[model samples]
Target: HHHHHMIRPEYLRVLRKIYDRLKNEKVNWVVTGSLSFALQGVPVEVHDIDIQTDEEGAYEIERIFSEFVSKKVRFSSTEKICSHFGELIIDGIKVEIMGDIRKRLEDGTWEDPVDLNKYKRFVETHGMKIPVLSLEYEYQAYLKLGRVEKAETLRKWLNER
Candidate 1:
C-alpha cells in the first residue's frame, strides 16, 4: 500500500488513521488545505491536517477524539472566525478540527453529509476511501486565506484540467 505518496508518509498515515477512526460517524467532513493537495497529487506542504466540517460533525469528532486534544479554542459570539476549534495530536501528527465554517463558493454542497457529487477514492495505502475536499474548494480557500501564489497555482492547474 505504500506507493511513495506525494504527501509526506507521516501526514498520509495520520489522515488515513483519522478516517479509519471516524468514517462511520454521521459527520460531514473533508481534508482541506495542503494535505489535500498532496493527496490529489499536487506538490504542497502541510505541517498538519485541516478538517472542514459542520458544528454537529465537529462535536462528534471532538467527542470521540478529544483525548488527543492538545489545544482547544471556542468562539462564543457569532462575530468571530470559528466556533468550535480543537487541535489534536495523534501519532505525533497534528490534527485541526474546524467548525462554524462559511462556504467558499455558492451552491457548494460537495462534502455536506448529504452531497456525493465528487467521487470518494480509496487510497490503497490509507486503506480507506478518503472523502477529499475538491480542488475548486481548496483553491477558493487559498484565496480566502490571501494566498495569491497558491490560488494562482490552482487557477493554472484548473485550466490544465
Candidate 2:
C-alpha cells in the first residue's frame, strides 16, 4: 500500500518493452512476487519485479540483457530449498528473475515447484501481453505469505471470475 510512491512512470513502460522482447524467446515465464498484486489491481508495496522462468530462459534473459544485470546468479545448487535469484535493472527499477522457481510453502519450507502455466493468466496492460498468476493461485500465495487481508481481497476477486 505504501509502495505506489516507489513506482516510476517509466517502470511500466520499460517492463512492457522487456516482456515484448521476451515474447520472441523460448520462455515460460510469469510475473511473481509482490508487484504482481498490483497487476491484479491491488495496492502492493514491493522493491522489485519478481520473475519466474525456466533455467534456460533465465540464462538467456541474463545473457542477452547482461548489460542490465544488477545481480548475478546466487545459488550454487538447484535444490528446491535453495533460493536463487538475479536482478536486472531498467530505468532504475530492479527486476529479479528467479531462474527456477521452487515454491516456498506455508509449512515454513520450500518445496512445491513453480508450474507457471498452471498459474498463468493472459492480460493486457500498458499495451503489452502480460503473463500473470491467476487469482486462484495468487490468493493462495498471499495466504501462504501470511497476508490475510490480501488473501481475502484476492479470494473475493476470484469469486467474480
Candidate 3:
C-alpha cells in the first residue's frame, strides 16, 4: 500500500493536460516501470514520467510544441542534443519522452499496445495487485541488464506471490 512519489495536485494537473493533448492527437503511449505499478496500488518512487514514441511521432510532438521545446525544454545542452529522449519540467515534475519503444518491443522485454480488454485481463492475471511487467519478463529484463538486485527482487516476488 505504499503510494508512489506523492504526485502533487499540480503535477497531476500537468500530467492530465499532457494526456489530454496526446489523446486528442492520437498518440500511442505505454506507461511502464514504477508508474504502471503505482496505478495498481504499489509503493514506489516515480522520479519522472517515462513515455515511448517513435522518431516520426517524436518529430510530430516536437513540431506541435516547438516553442515550448525551444524555450522551456531547452535543447541547447549536450544531454539535450544527444538524447533521443526529451524532458519537460512542469510543476516540478519531470516528464521524459523516450524514443526506445520500438527497440524494447523488438527485444521482447516489453509488450506492445493492446486493446482495453487485453490490457485489463493481463493486469488482472499477470499483475500482482500492483500493475507491473510480468514477473518472469521483469526478471529476464533485469538479468539482461546485469542488475542483480532487480533480478533478485523479481525472483523473490515471484516466489512469494
Best by lDDT: 2
Model 2 lDDT tens row, 1-161: 23444434565776776787787887777887665676766666666787767666677778767888898856534322344567899778788877665654457576656777878886676677778787678778767657645765798899989
Q: Is candidate 1 or candidate 2 better by lDDT?
A: 2
lDDT (Cα) of model 1: 0.66
What lDDT would each prediction earn against the true structure?
Answer: 0.66, 0.70, 0.46
Ranking by TM-score: 2, 1, 3
lDDT per residue for candidate 3 within 3-103, as digits (tens), equals: 43454455446556555456567443444445555444465666655544554455555555554453232222231122245665555666665443322
Candidate with top TM-score is 2
Residue-level lDDT tens digits of model 1 in 65-143: 8788787635332321334667789889888887655433334432233232353333344566776677666676567
* Ordered list by lDDT, greatest first: 2, 1, 3
TM-score of 2: 0.72
lDDT of 1 at 62: 77
Off by over 4 Å in 2: 1-8, 76-83, 103-112, 147-161
Report how far off residue 147 is in candidate 1 (Å). 7.5
Q: Model 3 RMSD to the real structure?
A: 10.3
